[PDB]
Amino acid sequence: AYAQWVIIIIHNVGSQDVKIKNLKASWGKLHADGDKDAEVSASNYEGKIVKPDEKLQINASGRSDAAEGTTGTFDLVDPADGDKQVRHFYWDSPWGSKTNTWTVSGSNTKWMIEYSGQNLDSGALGTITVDTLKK
Amino acid sequence: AYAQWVIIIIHNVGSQDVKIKNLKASWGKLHADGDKDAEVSASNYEGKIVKPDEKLQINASGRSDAAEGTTGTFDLVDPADGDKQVRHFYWDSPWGSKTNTWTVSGSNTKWMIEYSGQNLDSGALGTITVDTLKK
Amino acid sequence: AYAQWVIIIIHNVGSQDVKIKNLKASWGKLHADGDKDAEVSASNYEGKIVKPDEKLQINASGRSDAAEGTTGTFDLVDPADGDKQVRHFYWDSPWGSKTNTWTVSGSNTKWMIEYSGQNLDSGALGTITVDTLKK
Amino acid sequence: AYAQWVIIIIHNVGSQDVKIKNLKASWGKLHADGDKDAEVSASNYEGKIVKPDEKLQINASGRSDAAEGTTGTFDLVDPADGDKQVRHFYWDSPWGSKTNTWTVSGSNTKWMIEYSGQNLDSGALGTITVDTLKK
Amino acid sequence: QAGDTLNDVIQDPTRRNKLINDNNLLKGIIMGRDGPVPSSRELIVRPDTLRAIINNRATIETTTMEAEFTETLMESNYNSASVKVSAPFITANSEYSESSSFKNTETEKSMYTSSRYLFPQGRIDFTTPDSGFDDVIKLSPQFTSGVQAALAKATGTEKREALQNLFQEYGHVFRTKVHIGGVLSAHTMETFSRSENETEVKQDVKAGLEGAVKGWQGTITTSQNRKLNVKYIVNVVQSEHWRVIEVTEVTAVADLLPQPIRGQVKDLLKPLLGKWVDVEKVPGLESLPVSVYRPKGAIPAGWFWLGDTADASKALLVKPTLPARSGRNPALTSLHQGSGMTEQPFVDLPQYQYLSTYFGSFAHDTPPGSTLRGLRPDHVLPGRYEMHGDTISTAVYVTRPVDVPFPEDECFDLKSLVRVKLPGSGNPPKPRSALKKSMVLFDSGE
Amino acid sequence: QAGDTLNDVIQDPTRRNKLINDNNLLKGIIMGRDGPVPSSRELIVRPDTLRAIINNRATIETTTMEAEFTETLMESNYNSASVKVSAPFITANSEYSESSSFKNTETEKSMYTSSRYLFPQGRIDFTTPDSGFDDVIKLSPQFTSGVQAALAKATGTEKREALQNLFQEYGHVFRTKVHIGGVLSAHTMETFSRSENETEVKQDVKAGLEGAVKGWQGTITTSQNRKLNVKYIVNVVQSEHWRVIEVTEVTAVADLLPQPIRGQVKDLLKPLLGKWVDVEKVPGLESLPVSVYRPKGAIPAGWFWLGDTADASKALLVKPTLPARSGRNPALTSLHQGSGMTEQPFVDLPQYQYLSTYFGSFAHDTPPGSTLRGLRPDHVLPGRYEMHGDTISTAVYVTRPVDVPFPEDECFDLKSLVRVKLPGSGNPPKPRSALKKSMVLFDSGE
Ligand SMILES: CCCCCCCC/C=C/CCCCCCCC(=O)N[C@@H](COP(=O)(O)OCC[N+](C)(C)C)[C@H](O)/C=C/CCCCCCCCCCCCC
Ligand SMILES: CCCCCCCC/C=C\CCCCCCCC(=O)N[C@@H](COP(=O)(O)OCC[N+](C)(C)C)[C@H](O)/C=C/CCCCCCCCCCCCC
Ligand SMILES: CCCCCCCC/C=C\CCCCCCCC(=O)N[C@@H](COP(=O)(O)OCC[N+](C)(C)C)[C@H](O)/C=C/CCCCCCCCCCCCC
Ligand SMILES: CCCCCCCC/C=C\CCCCCCCC(=O)N[C@@H](COP(=O)(O)OCC[N+](C)(C)C)[C@H](O)/C=C/CCCCCCCCCCCCC
Ligand SMILES: CCCCCCCC/C=C\CCCCCCCC(=O)N[C@@H](COP(=O)(O)OCC[N+](C)(C)C)[C@H](O)/C=C/CCCCCCCCCCCCC
Ligand SMILES: CCCCCCCC/C=C\CCCCCCCC(=O)N[C@@H](COP(=O)(O)OCC[N+](C)(C)C)[C@H](O)/C=C/CCCCCCCCCCCCC
Ligand SMILES: CCCCCCCC/C=C\CCCCCCCC(=O)N[C@@H](COP(=O)(O)OCC[N+](C)(C)C)[C@H](O)/C=C/CCCCCCCCCCCCC
Ligand SMILES: CCCCCCCC/C=C\CCCCCCCC(=O)N[C@@H](COP(=O)(O)OCC[N+](C)(C)C)[C@H](O)/C=C/CCCCCCCCCCCCC
């Protein structure tokens, strides 16, 4: 159902490029901004480079009148050192549960990642803003 | 219902104070960060000064199981100009109607307000970041 | 319904001319000053210039006995730089809803716009005065 | 009814002060700016002084689902001349009648008073701006 | 030595000279930033005797002043005439700040009150040259030589700089009548709305302050519940201790010079040089009831214009005479564009004023707004409006001078134009001023 | 003795010399780290007499100051002009530190207040060479010989070091007008939001402090319930116990020298040597409304730049004149990378400031970051912002100098760039400063 949705904003607050890779929604569908009807394939985002000081928005939502949430994953990867992982993000906004999941796993000491705005109690997963910076 | 919720993050990006006023939750309830059970009073925010570079979070949501959604208002006013109104904000995440609503009105010209992150199609209203600055 | 009415007073408080473009009333009609029976075509306001210190009044209202409010838009445009857009004004006083909409969109720092007098609570949208200043 | 409303903006463009007196809403209710629910007392304006270049808003509107318009009187008087009457204003936005009314009377020859913006045909009485100037 | 009066002091050369020295009777006052402090250089030759009268009646005397920068003068017990004579110098040399508590708006009035509990012994009089008597005071040869050296310089600017230094060193006014004895002074200031009965306010403040000094507490409450801040001064402690308690007359130092030199000194002290030029009608503004005229052609380098005028004949251009220097108030001020929602200018320096509102878009970076200037507060006097037009949105005031009988207060009839209602918001306060005729020097070869 | 005034003290050579010695009237004031302490070496030659005026009005006066490092000057009863003249030296020699109780942010303002209960006896004046009168003060031959020796050294650095030692020994300013008598002083500081009515706060603090001194308690409560910490100073106890109670005028010691030597001394004391170089456009940053320029090529060895600028013509390089030494505030400071979530630099030393935000990633170990420097707080003055851009995310400020009429306070128009919204968090405070013109020496062969 469209009641299960998530917006992931990647904001590069540093001065180095960061890449998005392996973006995949196992449940639900990626869609356009402010338009849950305009489905978009993962190819629109996979391999893209956010570039410093600009934001890239990923919109995911459940299938309409479905009883299905939205579950997906993607890796933020550093291209400056042979495409090495920065972090691995996993989001789950299920239709048949209250506990949403937002896991940022992985390790890279050369990068600092903050995130805010998520809601894990009940309902939708909210608009999560993720500030990335290479130090 | 907790399924209907909103977070409002006022970020004073400028260099002068901005004051909250007339905060009022006509439906649902405010609550503390990350806990919809810990209800809070509007007085916890009324008249608060958001110092420059400071961030202030307001979390609202429906009731624990009631068919109500959430709805509220507040104003941003300029403490340094006799509490002249900067903007008037209205938020509504109904339980019955699918479409949400986030409206910013006002005409103060020596202020710049930019809000982003809202969802208007279906489900919870989401997280809304409101960057404020005084020219 | 004549009950749904709005008056927009463009007041050029600056020293440089401003222009009105793309005036279109999707619902209702444009009528003479204080005489709702005297219909007026949008051509009489399309492309007009408000010289500094002038006032231009646009009166819009619904049809006499119809469940039809009045909705419309126009653009304030700068004729000094090849009719570059200054602002986009949209008004809607509906018969079937109790909330009236008055939105000023667009952005260019070369102009300062200050509007006041609107009514969004109920009834007619009211009389709106818009001061424009090239600065 | 809330559909009947009026906003009287007193604007002292002169040098000497002007005082309000005998403010009285025979019908309907006063209220705060932009909020028809927040009723206000006439004492909040009685005897108030509008300093030069200052603006003072008086909002009136009918009661919620009453079938009542909004009617009232007040007077502008000159504090510097023994509270001599400058003008007497009567406003009326009936619910059961289509024709509104806004009449200003008085024969003070050392003041110039100019009012504009009222709507008299049908619907609300609109926003009325009054400019006062002592010669 | 019991029951000695001023006569005993004067008749004794030792005591007379001690009185002269201890009271700085041979020195002028320098109306500086710190107030009326006496100069450290003797201005007149030491007299052989003093003219004096004896007065031993002790009372309380109250005085009120409505001038702006005369607080310190009141604190020194200067009567009305002395404050009137000394006001120009204090105003020119005062320190300006926009946060001044004194207010003289169109609706609010402010006034200083001073109560002196006096213990007089007499009065001492000096004979000025203008009196025409035989015992005039003679200027010291040092001061005369300094004036001669100042006036002998090559360039007018150098002459004016030398004169300014000389008058900063020797003083601006000379006390011609002084009261000897002891005093206890209490001073305060009060601000009230002009609508209030002025006589009642004056009487209430006077009663409160006189009760304060009589009972001699930094705050005094009057019968009308007015909280007044009171500043106290003690000048009382035997003839050895008598001091000047009141000043009944002061004569400008420049007035003590001989006439042929007095004229030159007075002319060189005028802050501005003036000139009359042709004018051109501003294009547009056909809605207004009267035409608006501005200086025609390019403004000559170094000169300035004061504002828009309704006069169709000529306009006044002014040029400062003294180069700008730190610690000295410039005669003119530059203007800057307002913060927002207004096209009108704002004075860069606090307390300054300009005569007319700008009929257009003001931009200090380009002409003719680059050469528009304000005025120092001592240069202007309030005028009177004449309204033209029949609508609030088009009426304009013409600022005509207030007629006076004495030429000392005559003002220029520039017919400055003010706009009755300025569009937008946040506009500057409307000017109601006219330029003094005594501040402008014409026909000079400069 | 009773009834003796300053005239009697000055007439007697023994009493006059005792007054001169006990008050250190022949010595300059070193504005050092410990405050304005008089020098131990006589600066001027002992006069044969003093110019003095008599004044015995005892009263309470109050003064307020907004400058940051003028606490000690206020505690010494320096008027506004003297504090203004002495501020550069105090600041330069002050001991900077974080956690300073003084606050001068864009939201709140801090000020010092001082109330002096004065029992004066008169005022003593000295004649500066610039005055042009015949009784000028004569610098002692030792000071002139020291200056000559300093200016005769082989290298500019040695000359500057010699001058610095000489001015640390003989003082920085000379008191030209001083009041004699006794004084009880109470001093305090208050911080308050800029939104509050400044006049009301000033009046409340003045009333509280005046009451405190008049009733003469380490803490005071005013009418507005403000808690003030008050420091009390006693300088009152016969002509033998008279002391200096107020300084009305000071003159920089350098100004006392002859003009040909005065110019050289003034030039040699300038902290920084300046240079103009070509600029290059920073790659990238196409989103910003305006282009960003940095000094082109490699910075010459030993020179430093001040930040990114919007000027497309030239950039200003600066070089310190005095080698870094313990106990001396350096003219410039290195910058270090921020703690976290920011690429902006932070000043290494407590109270220094840089003029522009860094547009990129700052690394102090590599160029051009390694050659970026801040400025001592005395080198800069507040500027004004000109805004560019339509959205917060990309808007910038260009820092323009505040136009002033006096050339002494002119600041460079470097067009420093400041990012309106710095990404990330924990960024340094936004700079709004402009470099003073008087602190840079150009065209020197150094
Ligand atoms: C044949 C047998 C029939 C009878 C069996 C009963 C069936 C009911 C089912 C069992 C669920 C019971 C949920 C109760 C949640 C309590 C928490 C809560 O919802 N409480 C308030 C305030 O909650 P709040 O949001 O303010 O948070 C503060 C509270 N908190 C706990 C979080 C601290 C909130 O408004 C109120 C919400 C309304 C919920 C009531 C729904 C029950 C309807 C009864 C129908 C009876 C029909 C009978 C016909 C035959
Ligand atoms: C004659 C035989 C009858 C019995 C057979 C039927 C059995 C029904 C079983 C199961 C259905 C339920 C699946 C789950 C819904 C998944 C879609 C969804 O959860 N739907 C949400 C909203 O969906 P969404 O907003 O995302 O839609 C997109 C938005 N858009 C505007 C674009 C459309 C909307 O709240 C949800 C409402 C569902 C409430 C459940 C009530 C149960 C119905 C019992 C009917 C019994 C009839 C008996 C008569 C004799
Ligand atoms: C006496 C007779 C009484 C019974 C009559 C009742 C008829 C039901 C009425 C109308 C319900 C409206 C259904 C939802 C619309 C489909 C839209 C949609 O949700 N379809 C896909 C979403 O696909 P997607 O979101 O990606 O894009 C969509 C395309 N779009 C371009 C628009 C975006 C999504 O998975 C598919 C969901 C499964 C379909 C649910 C069907 C439930 C109806 C069971 C009726 C049983 C009656 C028999 C009882 C005896
Ligand atoms: C006459 C004919 C006889 C009819 C017999 C009735 C058979 C009913 C149909 C078959 C069951 C259908 C369930 C499987 C749906 C497949 C989608 C899915 O699979 N839905 C999950 C996925 O959603 P999820 O939230 O988990 O996504 C998060 C992803 N993650 C990986 C993290 C889990 C989600 O949970 C769970 C949804 C459960 C909704 C079922 C409600 C139906 C109630 C029936 C009432 C009976 C009335 C009888 C009237 C005659
Ligand atoms: C033959 C008799 C038929 C008539 C029976 C009368 C009942 C009429 C219908 C029911 C009331 C109408 C719903 C209004 C309240 C729902 C509020 C809400 O929206 N409820 C959300 C949860 O709210 P929330 O997430 O905030 O609580 C979480 C808090 N927690 C802390 C625990 C996480 C939760 O998903 C939503 C669930 C959907 C509720 C509809 C279920 C339909 C029932 C069909 C079966 C009827 C019996 C059949 C017998 C044969
Ligand atoms: C023998 C049995 C006879 C009796 C059976 C039925 C009795 C019903 C009794 C009780 C009244 C119920 C009203 C309660 C209002 C709650 C407060 C509110 O008011 N709920 C609004 C929230 O509105 P919203 O969330 O959208 O936003 C807020 C407003 N805002 C302006 C901000 C948008 C929203 O509309 C309301 C929606 C609720 C509709 C549920 C309908 C399903 C349940 C009835 C099915 C019965 C089947 C029975 C078969 C046997
Ligand atoms: C068996 C026979 C049944 C016949 C069916 C009739 C049912 C009606 C249903 C349809 C609703 C019609 C909505 C149309 C809105 C018109 C536009 C408007 O909203 N009109 C406003 C004001 O409009 P306006 O101010 O512009 O007019 C002034 C213009 N003028 C220039 C002249 C001044 C005016 O108040 C508002 C009035 C409220 C509507 C009145 C409803 C009448 C009820 C009759 C019940 C009869 C039951 C009989 C059972 C025995
Ligand atoms: C034997 C009986 C046979 C006769 C029965 C036939 C029933 C009539 C059928 C068809 C009605 C269709 C309306 C036609 C106008 C639609 C134009 C419109 O579209 N009207 C929107 C405009 O409103 P709005 O001002 O808000 O839009 C502008 C703002 N916007 C932002 C939206 C652009 C507004 O909602 C709509 C309101 C409609 C008024 C309600 C009338 C009640 C109808 C029941 C009459 C009952 C009679 C009883 C007899 C026994």
Ligand SMILES: CCCCCCCC/C=C\CCCCCCCC(=O)N[C@@H](COP(=O)(O)OCC[N+](C)(C)C)[C@H](O)/C=C/CCCCCCCCCCCCC
């Ligand atoms: C056999 C016995 C039967 C007896 C029949 C009794 C009927 C009496 C007749 C009628 C008079 C009663 C109307 C008085 C209106 C005064 C209130 C008002 O004019 N009301 C507005 C103003 O509403 P407002 O916006 O100002 O409220 C604030 C909004 N807020 C959101 C904040 C609440 C509101 O809009 C819209 C009003 C339009 C109402 C249409 C007319 C009523 C329809 C009657 C249907 C009768 C069918 C008869 C079947 C038998």
Ligand SMILES: CCCCCCCC/C=C\CCCCCCCC(=O)N[C@@H](COP(=O)(O)OCC[N+](C)(C)C)[C@H](O)/C=C/CCCCCCCCCCCCC
């Ligand atoms: C068997 C079927 C029976 C059907 C039941 C029908 C019940 C009616 C339903 C719903 C009405 C909805 C009113 C809500 C008002 C809101 C408060 C208000 O309108 N109150 C005042 C103004 O108060 P105020 O201006 O100060 O605003 C309030 C401020 N607040 C902060 C609180 C919002 C204002 O005049 C009041 C006007 C009265 C209008 C209602 C009249 C109802 C008449 C029914 C008669 C039924 C007889 C037959 C029964 C068998």
Ligand SMILES: CCCCCCCC/C=C\CCCCCCCC(=O)N[C@@H](COP(=O)(O)OCC[N+](C)(C)C)[C@H](O)/C=C/CCCCCCCCCCCCC
């Ligand atoms: C078998 C059972 C049948 C029961 C039937 C009983 C009906 C109840 C009787 C009558 C109530 C009368 C309300 C009292 C006035 C309200 C307050 C007021 O005062 N209403 C004025 C306000 O007008 P206004 O706003 O313009 O005043 C401002 C300007 N002014 C200068 C004048 C002050 C305005 O005029 C008056 C308008 C008239 C109201 C029309 C609605 C009446 C509906 C009749 C339904 C009949 C159904 C018949 C079914 C068989």
Ligand SMILES: CC(C)CCC[C@@H](C)[C@H]1CC[C@H]2[C@@H]3CC=C4C[C@@H](O)CC[C@]4(C)[C@H]3CC[C@]12C
């Ligand atoms: C006994 C039966 C046949 C009587 C039927 C009377 C019907 C036709 C009457 C009763 C009330 C009337 C309505 C009352 C008010 C208005 C509002 C006006 O702006 C348009 C006409 C309209 C909408 C009327 C249409 C006709 C109407 C519906």
Ligand SMILES: CC(C)CCC[C@@H](C)[C@H]1CC[C@H]2[C@@H]3CC=C4C[C@@H](O)CC[C@]4(C)[C@H]3CC[C@]12C
């Ligand atoms: C056959 C008998 C019962 C008469 C039926 C009359 C019906 C069809 C009449 C009565 C009132 C009428 C409505 C009155 C007013 C309006 C508003 C207008 O903007 C559109 C038409 C509309 C919505 C009318 C449609 C037709 C209508 C509903």
